[PDB]
């Protein structure tokens, strides 16, 4: 009934925020103090890498750009870029990678 909102848990700070769907993880991490770093405005640096603990199915699929910057920065199977990863619904749990 609230399909336009999603819960996002930053486990390094133990807080779950209810975000409007389509919000990027980086747009909440600094609001709660999570240690995810915003280091560029072009999606190329990869310093915003984030480990997706749960709920990867509720996230926007990675673009070809994200995949390239992920691989360039040794991102793993469950890592995503916080400045490019949008929460589309459901429940997601993340920690700084
Ligand atoms: S902040 Fe640079 S890739 Fe996300």
Residue numbers in the entry: -1 to 95
Copied sentences from the primary study:
Small electron transport proteins that bind FeS‐clusters are called ferredoxins (Fds). We recently showed two distinct ferredoxins, FdC and FdN, were essential for iron nitrogenase‐mediated nitrogen fixation in R. capsulatus. We discovered that FdC is the first [Fe2S2]‐cluster Fd involved in N2‐fixation under anaerobic conditions. FdC was shown to interact with an oxidoreductase of unknown function called FprA, encoded within the same operon as the gene for FdC (fdxC).
This [Fe2S2]‐cluster is located within 5 Å of the protein surface, likely to facilitate rapid electron transfer to partner proteins. FdC was found to comprise of five β‐sheets and two α‐helices, one flanking the β‐sheets and one situated on top of the protein close to the [Fe2S2]‐cluster. The [Fe2S2]‐cluster of FdC was coordinated by the thiolate side chains of four Cys residues (C38, C43, C46, and C81) in a planar fashion. Notably, a fifth Cys residue, C83, appeared in the centre of FdC, though it does not form coordinate bonds with the [Fe2S2]‐cluster. Only two polar residues (threonine 45 and glutamine 82) had side chains in close proximity to form hydrogen bonds with either the S2− ions or the thiolate side chains. Notably, this differed from structures of other plant and algal‐type Fds which rely on hydrogen bonds created with either one or two serine side chains to stabilize the active site. We discovered that FdC has many outward facing charged residues in close proximity to the [Fe2S2]‐cluster. To summarize, the spectroscopic characterization of monomeric FdC confirms the presence of a redox active [Fe2S2]‐cluster with a midpoint reduction potential of −285 ± 10 mV, which is unlikely to be an efficient electron donor to the reductase component of nitrogenase, including the R. capsulatus Fe‐nitrogenase system.
